[PDB]
Design a protein around this ligand. Structure first.
Ligand SMILES: *[C@@H]1O[C@H](CO)[C@@H](O[C@@H]2O[C@H](CO)[C@@H](O[C@@H]3O[C@H](CO)[C@@H](O)[C@H](O)[C@@H]3O)[C@H](O)[C@H]2NC(C)=O)[C@H](O)[C@H]1NC(C)=O
Ligand SMILES: C[N+](C)(C)CCO
Ligand SMILES: [Cl-]
Ligand code: NA
Length: 492
């Protein structure tokens, strides 16, 4: 197993060097697109969130589903969505919705995408702030504010760096594991994977009653990661469809390669006798600092220059993801809402002036949410919840179903939102209203659900869209309803 890992890391390093040379020169070129897509996809959530999920007792590796689902989402996109979206003149993911349903429905569907982008930005800001606070020894709120300011300045100024940033992430992450593994306080991770030396084994467990919840979460992560503007901008900006498919496949492979050292760092943190280090007792989890485990491992189990290399890798990943997130949000707003829904005649100066103010407002909101949070994996998971509930069924309807109307879209929107909201939300303090079978009280008194209700909400939204569209089409034609009642003008 060691030889295979060495071979794959050597192969990835060699192809990275080839990509760097090719990008400097600018046959080859499909490599640099995949590398840039990988740099866009992998950020603060892929590293700190994965380490925190592996480290926390009660989660383990079994419940760290996001790094695998988000990689499978790229494969699914390249398989089924890249070609249908490429030959219709679309510039934004919201264009088909506005062209088929209307501008108001596009504006309505804009909200979950903005919420997801905001959650992702908050998560990555929290990750970078925690790293800066631990390694440089600064107050956490100041560190988060500094990280947000640096990201905003980088995005504004930027308007083959991605390949070099990916190289920095790869080298900085992979150079730290050998030094942390050799510390005297760390035990054999192969033993502690199953045998519970200091805490529960870091390979988790799934009970016979939680299989449906596990599948529900996995489906949410895998299907909610597809409809994002950061991916579709790259898909639409390709020169051919095969180019986009190969780019998606290479990006997925790169993300899978990137995920491994974070899991190793989480296991190392879970296999440490902290009484033998300068951190001392209590443990990083007895103190409410379990989301800081990667910087703590870098600072207290590695030499100083290794910790600085890890800091540089985290900074590179966070910058490369934040730039794309902010740009996608601002572009979506400035094109689809401000210039299409109203004020259709606007000069180019007005558009850039709108873009800058949107960038600042989005950054401020993400900074506030990052300041108010206490977990990185939670926001990374939640960034795709409403996307999966709302946007995915309607994308399926517009791409592959003929006969969709504005009526079915309204019905599906309302039904999906109702079911999801009524289900409950244990991260907040919202309580369920339906109480599906298998509910149990938590430590905080909040009821959790063992029934897979989010997938049910998604399927209900899709089926309601189809059924209401065809019912309206039958009703307005063939008499029955006179034409004056066609308010949406969807059937005429
Ligand atoms: C964290 O590590 C330190 C360092 O080893 C631990 O300190 C150790 O504490 C034990 C008891 O608390 C000491 O044992 C004592 O030995 C004397 C004989 O010298 C005996 O008469 C006493 O009754 C007691 O058994 C041990 O000497 C001491 N080690 C050092 C180097 O001072 C500490 O206990 C560790 N903390 C935890 C929670 O394990
Ligand atoms: C944008 N997502 C949150 C869906 C994936 C990040 O890796
Ligand atoms: Cl991320
Ligand atoms: Na990145």
């Amino acid at each position: 197993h060691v030889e295979g890992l060495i071979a794959i890391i050597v192969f990835y390093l060699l192809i990275l060097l080839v990509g760097i040379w090719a990008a400097w020169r600018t046959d080859i070129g499909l490599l640099v697109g995949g590398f840039t897509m990988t740099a866009t996809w992998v950020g603060g959530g892929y590293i700190n969130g994965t380490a925190e999920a592996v480290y926390v007792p009660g989660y383990g590796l079994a419940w760290a589903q996001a790094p695998i689902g988000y990689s499978l989402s790229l494969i699914l996109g390249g398989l089924f969505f890249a070609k249908p979206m490429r030959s219709k003149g679309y510039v934004t993911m919201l264009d088909p919705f506005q062209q088929i349903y209307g501008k108001r429905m596009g504006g309505l569907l804009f909200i979950p995408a903005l919420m997801g982008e905001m959650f992702w930005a908050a998560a990555i800001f929290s990750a970078l702030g925690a790293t800066i606070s631990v390694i440089i020894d600064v107050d956490m709120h100041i560190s988060v504010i500094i990280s947000a300011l640096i990201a905003t300045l980088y995005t504004l100024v930027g308007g083959y760096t991605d390949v070099v940033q990916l190289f920095c992430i790869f080298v900085g992450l992979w150079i730290s594991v050998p030094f942390a593994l050799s510390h005297p306080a760390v035990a054999d991770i192969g033993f502690t994977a199953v045998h519970a030396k200091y805490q529960k084994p870091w390979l988790g467990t799934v009970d016979s009653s939680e299989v449906y919840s596990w599948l529900d979460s996995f489906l949410l992560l895998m299907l909610g990661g597809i409809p994002w503007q950061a991916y579709f901008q790259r898909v639409l900006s390709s020169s051919s469809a095969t180019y986009a498919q190969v780019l998606s496949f290479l990006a997925a492979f790169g993300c899978l390669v990137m995920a491994i050292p974070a899991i190793l760092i989480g296991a190392i943190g879970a296999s440490t006798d902290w009484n033998q280090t300068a951190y001392g007792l209590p443990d990083p989890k007895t103190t409410e600092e379990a989301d800081m485990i990667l910087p703590i491992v870098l600072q207290y189990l590695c030499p100083v220059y290794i910790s600085f290399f890890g800091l540089g890798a985290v900074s590179a990943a966070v910058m490369s993801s934040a730039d794309s997130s902010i740009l996608s949000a601002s572009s979506m707003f400035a094109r689809n809402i401000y210039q299409l829904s109203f004020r259709q005649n606007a000069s180019d100066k007005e558009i850039v002036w709108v873009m800058r103010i949107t960038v600042f407002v989005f950054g401020a909101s993400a900074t506030a949410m990052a300041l108010l949070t206490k977990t990185v994996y939670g926001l990374w998971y939640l960034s795709s919840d409403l996307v999966y509930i709302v946007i995915f069924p309607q994308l399926l309807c517009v791409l592959f179903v003929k006969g969709t109307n504005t009526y079915g879209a309204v019905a599906g929107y309302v039904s999906g939102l109702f079911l999801r909201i009524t289900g409950g939300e244990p991260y907040l303090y919202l309580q369920p209203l339906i109480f599906y079978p298998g509910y149990y009280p938590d430590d905080n008194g909040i009821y959790n659900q063992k029934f897979p209700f989010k997938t049910l909400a998604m399927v209900t939204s899709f089926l309601t869209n189809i059924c209401i569209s065809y019912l309206a089409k039958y009703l307005f034609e063939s008499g029955t309803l006179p034409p004056k009642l066609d308010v949406f003008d969807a059937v005429v």
